Amino acid sequence: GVVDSCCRNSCSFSTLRAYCDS
Amino acid sequence: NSLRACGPALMDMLRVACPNGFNS
């Protein structure tokens, strides 16, 4: 999830955004 | 072109990046 993608690794802003609810 | 955030900062960033929120 978001922690794996953006904390354990760096992520792009569009990747952060994809982890939002919609 | 990258971001890295852990703990409260990551939650604060999701809060402003996400209009309809997030729930993991």
Curated annotation (Swiss-Prot), chain A:
Bridged cysteine pairs (disulfide): C6-C11
Portion of the full sequence shown: 87 to 108 of 108
Protein name, as recorded: Insulin-like peptide 5 A chain
